[PDB]
Amino acid sequence: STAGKVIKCKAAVLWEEKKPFSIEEVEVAPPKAHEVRIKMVATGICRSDDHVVSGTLVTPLPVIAGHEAAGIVESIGEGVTTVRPGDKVIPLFTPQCGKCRVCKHPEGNFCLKNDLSMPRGTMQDGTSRFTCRGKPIHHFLGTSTFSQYTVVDEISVAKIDAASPLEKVCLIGCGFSTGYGSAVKVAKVTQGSTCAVFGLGGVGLSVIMGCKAAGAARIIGVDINKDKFAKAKEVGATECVNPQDYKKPIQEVLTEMSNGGVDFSFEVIGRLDTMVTALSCCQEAYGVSVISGVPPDSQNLSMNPMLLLSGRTWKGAIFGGFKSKDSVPKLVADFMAKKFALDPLITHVLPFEKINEGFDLLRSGESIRTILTF
Amino acid sequence: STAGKVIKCKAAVLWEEKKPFSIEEVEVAPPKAHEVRIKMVATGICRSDDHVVSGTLVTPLPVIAGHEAAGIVESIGEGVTTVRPGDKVIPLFTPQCGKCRVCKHPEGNFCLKNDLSMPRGTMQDGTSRFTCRGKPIHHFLGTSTFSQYTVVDEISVAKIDAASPLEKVCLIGCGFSTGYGSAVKVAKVTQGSTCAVFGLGGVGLSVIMGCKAAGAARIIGVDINKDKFAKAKEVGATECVNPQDYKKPIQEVLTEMSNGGVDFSFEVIGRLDTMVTALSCCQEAYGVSVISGVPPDSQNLSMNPMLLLSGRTWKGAIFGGFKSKDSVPKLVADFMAKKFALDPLITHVLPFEKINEGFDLLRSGESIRTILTF
Ligand SMILES: [Zn+2]
Ligand SMILES: [Zn+2]
Ligand SMILES: [Zn+2]
Ligand SMILES: [Zn+2]
What we know:
The structure is a homodimer.
Chain A: E1 7-13, E2 22-28, E3 35-44, H1 47-54, E4 68-76, E5 88-91, H2 101-104, E6 130-132, E7 135-137, E8 149-153, E9 157-159, H3 166-169, H4 175-187, E10 194-198, H5 202-213, E11 218-222, H6 229-234, E12 239-241, H7 250-257, E13 264-267, H8 272-280, E14 288-291, E15 301-303, H9 306-309, E16 313-316, H10 324-336, E17 348-351, H11 355-364, E18 370-373
Parallel strand pairs in A: 10-11, 10-13, 11-12, 13-14, 14-16, 17-18
Antiparallel strand pairs in A: 1-2, 2-6, 3-4, 3-8, 3-18, 4-5, 5-9, 6-7
Helix pairs in contact in A: 4-5
The complex binds zinc ion (4 copies).
């Protein structure tokens, strides 16, 4: 009874930069070829969504943001073979087309069909499925999850376990997978190793989780906010250090604590200075440092290339380095098998309509993660 | 009739920064336990030796420099098991003690017994085997090959094929191995890949040879000096580009040429700007950039971490990433098996006594490599 027809529903539209989200009645067009319309069940509030508001992550406005989410398929357009009406799904802000240079590469995941490098804010076909009072509203990262219903291209959605709790697994759409993959996929943390995680928010916690699943012997949480330590240890951190406690630079403290440098360091914060600090605190000959947060408005950092000449490896990634469509279902499966817990990351749950409160919570730093429910 | 006794011989002593090498009669003391006295047959002039002259590379003076060489063991001290009087050997400026954390790591090679990080200019026991007119002279990187005879610690020498041409395999002591390993050991260039090599001196040529051995489909030579192109092609370059020919930045032309970025890039020059350019011209999602030259006096480079966030990997290494004692013999073996050639790298050959000329040749840029002979 909705298939093939425009659906009228509510969405959170951002009409202009630096403005609160406006809950509006919007029209969601039915899926065209290879597209999938999804009824949203839950969506997380991610810092990246806030960068849009800030005009820091440039993408065309007005837009429906939101990229970390889970829902149920309402209908599919022609030619769609990977999901069916009724399936539980997670939108993939990093698509997996399967055919570009990158998707075919054993090590690449940044699919060239992405709307991140040069944001267009549309469907793959250059159009939008969203209107508010006749006016076109843009899409965001091919997902647009801050709406009761969205339409995404098939390469930007993955089918997940029919028994999954969507209020929890939605985190796999961004925050968790980013942190988790940084450790298990990008760094390739090894058993018995020593790890240093800079930034103990939601993503840093997921890094710890990855280091633990990988069997790290030591995981040193680093953060200037000691209130983050309890939860960090709770998910696997062996120790926690607050750089503000020390009279010496933190790379020194970490090098000395790890008897010469750690095996693996992670910067999840996106700070120029900590990214360099994190690089230096890894062992000079075989240490690996992984970054996962870089604000779209980043200036250039300044570092000494001698940090690299000795043997260090520096790398970054998007979405934890996971090929999205392949990985998302496996991660949910892992969750369903009770291999890792997501609850520690969820500190707040609010009905969708209270989105702006959820953003206040994000900006204040009070929450690790707010989940919005429909 | 020299074993157990002091040997009087000639060496090139550098008495003070910024002065010509002085050929002096020097006394070379007998080898103590786990030490090896070597009669030099050939040694290359490497940029890093010039850095000592310039004070770029800080190490105690007065000193006998030289770290790229080959020779024949004159005698061994007590406890030595890896080489015997009469063996052809190559000093390892990067030691392989085999017992430290780095030597035991599958990926590390910058052995913690090195005298590079904090140069002391002695044998491992903190003393020197050199005197000139009774004054002690320092060692350099535990090799000191600018002498008719040197004494090195056992962990800093490797035995090689008894049939090797020392005038040529000496290059394996530094220049060749550094470039060749950057490709085959550090980057792990794969078959059918596209590589970009910035800097076509001896080290870059060696990089090219490794890309070729690894089966690279394309190897693009980059240098502002077109007189380097012929040799680069001779050793494997499929094409050569000169940044000065273009009205746009080289990373752009390289990205366009490789249809979205190259698989592997190498900076062998040691320039802050080209290091960053090299990084940027590799594919954003799975590209790898490897540096091999960082002047001891290097400033901080400036780069945007957004280059790493997409999926790029940035690394450096000393000695081509090779575990020195294990690798050197195998490289000579490959040479002897006709796997690669060294002739193309040798442009000048001078009697040891003409060391200062060889350095003029290096400073002018007119040699790829000068080899000195005894
Ligand atoms: Zn996100
Ligand atoms: Zn793709
Ligand atoms: Zn060692
Ligand atoms: Zn050298």
